């Protein structure tokens, strides 16, 4: 993933 | 320091903590060692700008592609700029630091993106407290594997977030401690030397082995 865990 | 962390990890791992007849992981718990800071959210825009992140105290930071770092404190105005050579400057956004305006804009973009889209890690954790007069760490370096992102903070802490199951480790060489956040978001802080003596579950043991490998890597690319 290019970002940490989504809301 | 990384060297100290390696020694600590080698010591507990060499003791084969999960290969004991009776495990008493609970006896290694030390809540007084809970970290002050950890990475709560992050965004990898290293294709063009760098790596942006949020610490658990709501401050945000970025490790730019040019190796400079900028931190915006949780009061939304205070700044700490770290140049390539490590020189630190303490400024305010309101003061309009001319050379930093573009970097400030990028950081605010990251802050806003993370606040709108991302979940805060360790939302149920209460960090410990120590001083306050000079103490916000910045991101020294980081890298990603197929399994995790490894974050190395300037206070010596190493954090590893596993992608597959959302489990996380926060390692501190000053406390010689590890904080494990499990798939249920439950957490515990353990003294590493006590895990060596009392043992731990497979799972934490396997993650600690992985952590040692990551620390060796950090030292190799030093």
UniProtKB/Swiss-Prot annotation, chain B:
Species per Swiss-Prot/TrEMBL record: Homo sapiens (Human)
Induction (record text): By growth-stimulating agents.
Family: Belongs to the protein kinase superfamily. Ser/Thr protein kinase family. CDC5/Polo subfamily.
Effect of residue 120 to R: Severe mitotic defects leading to prometaphase delay. Increased localization at kinetochores leading to increased levels of phosphorylated BUBR1
Tissue: Placenta and colon.
Keywords (A to Z) from UniProt: Acetylation, ATP-binding, Cell cycle, Cell division, Centromere, Chromosome, Cytoplasm, Cytoskeleton, Isopeptide bond, Kinase, Kinetochore, Mitosis, Nucleotide-binding, Nucleus, Phosphoprotein, Repeat, Serine/threonine-protein kinase, Transferase, Ubl conjugation
Post-translational modification: Ubiquitinated by the anaphase promoting complex/cyclosome (APC/C) in anaphase and following DNA damage, leading to its degradation by the proteasome. Ubiquitination is mediated via its interaction with FZR1/CDH1. Ubiquitination and subsequent degradation prevents entry into mitosis and is essential to maintain an efficient G2 DNA damage checkpoint.
Example of a GO biological process term: protein phosphorylation
Region (Linker): 121-135
Name the record gives this protein: Serine/threonine-protein kinase PLK1
Cross-link (Glycyl lysine isopeptide (Lys-Gly) (interchain with G-Cter in ubiquitin)) at residue(s): 120
Localisation per UniProt entry: Nucleus; Chromosome, Centromere, Kinetochore; Cytoplasm, Cytoskeleton, Microtubule organizing center, Centrosome; Cytoplasm, Cytoskeleton, Spindle
GO function terms (MF aspect): anaphase-promoting complex binding; ATP binding; identical protein binding; magnesium ion binding; microtubule binding; protein kinase activity; protein kinase binding; protein serine kinase activity
Keyword Hydrolase assigned: no
Stretches assigned to the POLO box domain: 38-116, 138-220
Covered residues, full protein: 373 to 594 of 603
Effect upon mutating residue 43 to A: Loss of centrosomal localization and of S-phase progression
Main location: nucleus
Modified residues (Phosphoserine): 3, 78
Effect of residue 55 to A: No effect on centrosomal localization, nor on S-phase progression. Loss of centrosomal localization and of S-phase progression
């Amino acid at each position: 993933p290019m970002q940490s865990t989504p809301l | 320091h990384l060297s100290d962390m390696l020694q600590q990890l080698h010591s507990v791992n060499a003791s084969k903590p999960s290969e004991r007849g009776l495990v008493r992981q609970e006896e290694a718990e030390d809540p007084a060692c809970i970290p002050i800071f950890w990475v709560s959210k992050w965004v990898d825009y290293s294709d063009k700008y760098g790596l942006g992140y949020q610490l658990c105290d709501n401050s945000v930071g970025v490790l730019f592609n040019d190796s400079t770092r900028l931190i915006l404190y949780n009061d939304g105005d205070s700044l700490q700029y770290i140049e390539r050579d490590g020189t630190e400057s303490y400024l305010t956004v309101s003061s309009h630091p001319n050379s930093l305006m573009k970097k400030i804009t990028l950081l605010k973009y990251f802050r806003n993106y993370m606040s709108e889209h991302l979940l805060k890690a360790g939302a149920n954790i209460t960090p410990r407290e120590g001083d306050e007069l000079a103490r916000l760490p910045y991101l020294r370096t980081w890298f990603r594997t197929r399994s995790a992102i490894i974050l190395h903070l300037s206070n010596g802490s190493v954090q590893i977030n596993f992608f597959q199951d959302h489990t996380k480790l926060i390692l501190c060489p000053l406390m010689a401690a590890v904080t494990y956040i499990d798939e249920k978001r439950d957490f515990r802080t353990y003294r590493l030397s006590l895990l060596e003596e009392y043992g731990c579950c497979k799972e934490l043991a396997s993650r600690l082995r992985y952590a040692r490998t990551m620390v060796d890597k950090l030292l190799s690319s030093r």
